[PDB]
């Protein structure tokens, strides 16, 4: 495979460690699905770090029974133990339902990253590739930015 | 030729069949070396402990010497068998009767020395 959405321009078919030699297709298809999903989650999480820093922690109470003003939960690592285990269970359940919804089984429309958002369905103006490739490139960039951000959050000690 | 799961199940066929004595693609020297390594590594055991010089610093060395002696004695016995019976079950084309078995026994002696030395090394270390 040498012509899919991934190959942007600054680097061509960038497979330095040869995961594509004798393209197993199904392997590549599911790795592309994993890339799309990981990129989407990385974009969401990079939001979940950089937006609570500038925008103040939510005006609210999070857990109505255990006094979480969102201000005692710090932005970055360590919030894993601050957000309630029940709240973690509920966000886990949300993600689990979102996937256990429309199947992403091999060959299904969910297996290529298509799920049914359609926020930007440009009317086929030579731009479906634009949005798909932009999502993939921003996914790679957001995953790398997330790794750097978490390394800064832990290494330095907190936030940034 | 009776059939039993211990002697005719696929596990038995592919277990005895994949042993050094029967594994495909092995030269006679490879079979001898593998069997010898197994035997020599086993034989150092019952001599270092459970022996005359058990509670001595040289228990491992005495066990190694005794294991090498046992390997040599059984290798001389195998040479005797090859010289008398000439099993002929491992000889290649042409050659002579019992050449393959004799090569197997010689490399069994070599592998026995090697495995006994390896066991003695792992006993002295660690």
């Amino acid at each position: 495979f040498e012509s899919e959405l991934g190959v942007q321009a600054p680097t061509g078919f960038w497979d330095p460690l040869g995961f594509a030699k004798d393209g197993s297709m199904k392997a590549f298809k599911r790795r592309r699905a994993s890339e799309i999903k990981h990129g989407r989650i990385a974009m969401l999480a990079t939001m979940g770090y950089i937006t609570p820093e500038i925008t103040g922690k939510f005006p609210g109470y999070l857990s109505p029974s255990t006094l979480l003003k969102y201000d005692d939960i710090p932005n970055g690592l360590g919030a894993i133990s601050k957000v309630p285990a029940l709240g973690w269970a509920q966000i886990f359940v949300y993600c689990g339902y979102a996937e256990l919804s429309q199947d992403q089984t091999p060959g299904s429309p969910g297996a290529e990253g298509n799920f049914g958002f359609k926020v930007l369905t440009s009317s086929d103006p030579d731009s479906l590739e634009k949005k798909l490739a932009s999502e993939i490139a921003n996914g790679r960039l957001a995953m790398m930015a997330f790794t750097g951000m978490a390394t800064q959050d832990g290494l330095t000690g907190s936030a940034w | 030729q009776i059939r039993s799961p211990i002697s005719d199940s696929r596990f038995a066929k592919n277990f005895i069949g994949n042993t050094a004595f029967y594994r495909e693609g092995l030269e006679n020297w490879q079979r001898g070396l593998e069997i010898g390594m197994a035997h020599g590594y086993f034989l150092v055991g019952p001599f270092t402990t459970l022996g005359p010089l058990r509670n001595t610093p040289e228990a491992a060395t005495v066990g190694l010497l005794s294991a090498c002696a046992v390997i040599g004695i059984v290798s001389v016995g195998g040479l005797l068998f090859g010289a008398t019976v000439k099993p002929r079950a491992f000889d290649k084309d042409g050659a002579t009767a019992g050449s393959g078995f004799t090569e197997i026994i010689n490399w069994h002696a070599v592998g026995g020395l090697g495995g006994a030395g390896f066991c003695h090394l792992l006993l002295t270390l660690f």
Binding site: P16, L17, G18, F19, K21, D22, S24, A27 | G25, L125, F126
Partner: protein, 176 residues
């Protein structure tokens, strides 16, 4: 066997004693697997002899014995300094590697393990999610680089073992 991976301009097809003079492709494949595995192990060992003299690991080997990475003597003294539990665990890990993810399939290329990516990257250890399959023609330069780097590292690790055996130490004296 001229034309196989490994033949490099500095010497060419070497075979002075003619160990692989006859065809016997099985023996050549076995010796190629042995050469590749010995080279990989020797590159690993050369790294394991170089790096500890610069990056003694932060933590401690045995928390319940206080053995920290910054005190085990480097070279052939950790054999009798590191606790036997650690050495047994390392041997067991190598055993599981070779009996499991790194067991050579005879249909594949000599040094080709399906579970590993190109530069040796363990693409297993990630859900066990397979890796590359040998393509000699495109990566030929990398193939020969790995092969002769492994040769060099085998000679190097032998030399450094004898350096430790002679000088007794692994500091500056060993390296001269």
């Amino acid at each position: 066997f001229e034309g196989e991976l490994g033949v490099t301009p500095p010497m060419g097809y070497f075979d002075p004693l003619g160990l692989s003079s006859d065809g016997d492709k099985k023996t050549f494949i076995r010796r190629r697997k042995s050469e590749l595995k010995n080279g990989r192990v020797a590159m690993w060992a050369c790294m394991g002899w170089i790096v500890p003299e610069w990056y003694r690991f932060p933590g401690e080997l045995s928390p319940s014995s206080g053995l920290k990475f910054s005190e085990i003597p480097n070279g052939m003294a950790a054999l009798k300094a590191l606790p036997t539990e650690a050495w047994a665990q390392m041997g067991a890990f190598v055993a599981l590697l070779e009996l499991g993810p790194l067991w050579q399939d005879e249909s594949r290329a000599p040094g080709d393990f399906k579970t590993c990516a190109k530069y040796g990257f363990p693409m297993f250890f990630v859900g066990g999610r397979e890796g590359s399959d040998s393509d000699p023609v495109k990566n030929q330069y990398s193939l020969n680089s790995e092969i002769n780097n492994g040769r060099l590292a085998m000679m190097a690790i032998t030399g450094m073992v004898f350096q430790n055996g002679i000088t007794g130490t692994t500091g500056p004296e060993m390296w001269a």
